[PDB]
Amino acid sequence: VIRHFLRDDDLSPAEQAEVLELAAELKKDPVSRRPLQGPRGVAVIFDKNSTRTRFSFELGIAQLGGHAVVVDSGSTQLGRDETLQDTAKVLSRYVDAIVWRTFGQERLDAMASVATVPVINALSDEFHPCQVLADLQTIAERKGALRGLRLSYFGDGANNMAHSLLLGGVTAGIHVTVAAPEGFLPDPSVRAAAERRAQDTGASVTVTADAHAAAAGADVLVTDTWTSMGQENDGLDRVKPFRPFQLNSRLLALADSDAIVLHCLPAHRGDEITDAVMDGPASAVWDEAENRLHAQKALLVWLLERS
Amino acid sequence: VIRHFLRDDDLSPAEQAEVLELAAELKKDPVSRRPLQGPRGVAVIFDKNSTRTRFSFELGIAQLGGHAVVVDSGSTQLGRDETLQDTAKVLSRYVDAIVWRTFGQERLDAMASVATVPVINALSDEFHPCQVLADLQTIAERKGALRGLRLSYFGDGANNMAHSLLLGGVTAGIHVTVAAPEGFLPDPSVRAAAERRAQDTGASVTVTADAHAAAAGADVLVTDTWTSRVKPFRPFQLNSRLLALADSDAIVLHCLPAHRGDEITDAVMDGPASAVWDEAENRLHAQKALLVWLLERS
Amino acid sequence: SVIRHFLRDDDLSPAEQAEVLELAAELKKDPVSRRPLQGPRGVAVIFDKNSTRTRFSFELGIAQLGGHAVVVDSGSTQLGRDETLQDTAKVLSRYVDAIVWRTFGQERLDAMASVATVPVINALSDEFHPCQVLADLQTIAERKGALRGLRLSYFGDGANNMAHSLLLGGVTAGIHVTVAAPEGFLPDPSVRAAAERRAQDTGASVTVTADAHAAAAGADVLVTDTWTSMGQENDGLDRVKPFRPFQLNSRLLALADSDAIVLHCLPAHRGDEITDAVMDGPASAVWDEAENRLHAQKALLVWLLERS
């Protein structure tokens, strides 16, 4: 059985713990594991723009001994000239894993349904699970055991980061709160999956429109841009509902005195997060970005040896 | 004293056999040849979109120890800011071979006239010779000796795949048939070159509008998308009806991407005659063999 | 230690430039003998503008130092739009050991270098092209030996990146540099003054003239470049008539030293700034010059990495 990573709950709590431990080991010894020596190939396909995911996967694959074939948005978007299933079958003959940033989750599901190699979600409309592996590695290295920590996410509660912080966070035993305005709440199916997974780990799920209540006592405060490129023409004012949820100094003062701040980047300073918070002593955004490299190398090692 | 690969007949029958033998060796032992260790560079330039050619060349070059510099069609078109001859001279100072997917064959000829390193056609409007090397490797590993086999291509008989199956097929001793409607027949000078090469190998060339006759007794049945306007080609659809007419143990090939329901049906493409996935894999092995072979002769 | 960047030619002292150029000759002889980036370690190579020579030379050179170039080209969204240049520089510094960047305004390079924790290298900007001039100096040294006291004349637009870098990099090597350009197209005053100060240290000199024949006479090296960059195509000027007298043609080359060599960074517009006869003739060193982008930039990277 081939293991894929299309959503955070694809890993059990025990498996997630294995990946996060390998991530810590690979951060210490970054070229000690060469499962892709040869080089073996890995597909890294971008239907959307990327800086952090592009650099971290391309270099991480190289440091595992492999060669990343990076496909840009200049190539014809996949699924136009042939079925995604046909593409997955041919790519499986060239590479040992397929890393793909795309739109609908169903596109990832289609490729994983027929690929003979692991398929990894490098960002979809619905989830960003490699980002949250790096977030969890960052939280662990700054706070220790993840179980019982309180994490609050602020902004659009139905975007990929909100969904993956729910799923990935409760898998780690984190008490996850999503603070979002009315009409921007997590997908019900994702919320229910996080609630079921939380039963197994002692975690919990909270969804609230009360930003100050979400910030109070939190160990980790997280936010993300409020609007994806596909939502810019959706007809909504996507600024006025979110301003109460801005991660600013006043909000940070409400959290635990030792709280840290995460943001997957790119940040739009002055919108979802302020300069004072992002450049202040609680910010862990640069270590978080670095840990994309280490966490994704661990994920690849782990999937490859189980597939 | 420098060898290029712009069309299938650039290799003699004997040299094609050498490259195909190397392809089988490299498929068994994919990192056993490292002529590009260093790394030395290879340019891989795309004037137009690619999946299979991009992956197969980029990874194949890496597995020869080299480093492919992949130039995308999003980058400024080649020969727009300076002559192709100036580009060829400069690239020859950085890389040991130039792989190029373009349109007009005369562009490939211009590059190859001045480059001091091998130039390889990664797909042109006229030929797709690296695809046919992979096809020949696929046929060989399933049927053994190529000489005397019957291969039929169906559909648009005027495109690069039809031309290269003609030229590369007769170079291997294959009796090649193109089944195509009038107005979409092979270029006469390509057909004439194929008939000429066929005299040396025991091969032959047939061009027919009768898909049933072409399918009857065929050992290899091949098709490709119809446009690069569909009414003339429908009778040449590679479906279960035609396949039922072929020889026992016949192989089905399609260079990809496929438009399922047009030139080929799901039942044929997903059925037990289909070798389209091995065929696509063999782009990697056959192109590595081609590069090894060209580099040691250049 | 401090972090050394290479944004303009004078970022290297004369002694430091000599070290880089010596390393360039050593690496040309033994191209895989230095592996500071083995691992591989990453290097970012970002192109806000098109390139062939800089793209191939940096991507392969980095690989031959053992590293892995992450090449970002113009189809990926332009840097500075999705997030600040400073945020980008901080993030890249966590993934790579150096940042190579072809961009527009020099101030954009200054912004990344202010926050980056790794060397930033100018791979061509509006104001300078210092990696080209390192390759030019390597080529001249190959052909002529000692650079000190040679006479080099550049012809064409006196205010573009190649004129500025030939001034600064040339006098840093002890070369007497002349820029021959029509009035109105003269070097930036602050670059001219900086080159005059640096020339005083090396015994070199700076000359700026509208007299192309006088600039060619006695020269050891004649250099030109295209007259018009993309950003100037719509500046309203006739950018042909003023530059015709400055064309590097056979008549001009005949006025220089009988063993003079000809350089051109490429791409060339044959028939405008240079003629076929000159570019394809025996004085032309343009192909060696292009090849030396590989060697000189490898030397630069080795040198910066060991000091950062």
UniProtKB/Swiss-Prot annotation, chain C:
SUPFAM superfamilies the record matches: Aspartate/ornithine carbamoyltransferase (SSF53671)
Predominant location: cytoplasm
Subcellular localization(s) per the UniProt record: Cytoplasm
Pathway: Amino-acid biosynthesis; L-arginine biosynthesis; L-arginine from L-ornithine and carbamoyl phosphate: step 1/3
Enzyme class: transferase
A single Gene Ontology CC term: cytoplasm
InterPro entries: Asp/Orn_carbamoyltranf_P-bd, Asp/Orn_carbamoylTrfase, Asp/Orn_carbamoylTrfase_sf, Asp_carbamoyltransf_Asp/Orn-bd, Orn/put_carbamltrans, OTCase_ArgI
Highest taxon listed in the record's lineage: Bacteria
PROSITE patterns xref list: CARBAMOYLTRANSFERASE (PS00097)
Disulfide bonds: none
Keyword Transferase: yes
Known catalytic reactions: carbamoyl phosphate + L-ornithine = L-citrulline + phosphate + H(+)
Record text on activity regulation: Competitively inhibited by L-norvaline (NVA).
Keywords: Amino-acid biosynthesis, Arginine biosynthesis, Cytoplasm, Transferase
Residues annotated for carbamoyl phosphate binding in this entry: 51-54, 78, 102, 129-132, 265-266, 293
Entry EC number(s): 2.1.3.3
Gene Ontology biological-process annotations: arginine biosynthetic process via ornithine; citrulline biosynthetic process; L-arginine biosynthetic process
A single GO molecular function term of this UniProt record: ornithine carbamoyltransferase activity
Amino-acid positions noted as binding L-ornithine in the UniProt annotation, renumbered to this chain: 161, 225, 229-230
Similarity-based family: Belongs to the aspartate/ornithine carbamoyltransferase superfamily. OTCase family.
Biological role stated in the UniProt entry: Reversibly catalyzes the transfer of the carbamoyl group from carbamoyl phosphate (CP) to the N(epsilon) atom of ornithine (ORN) to produce L-citrulline, which is a substrate for argininosuccinate synthetase, the enzyme involved in the final step in arginine biosynthesis.
Summary of subunit composition and partner proteins: Homotrimer.
Full protein name: Ornithine carbamoyltransferase
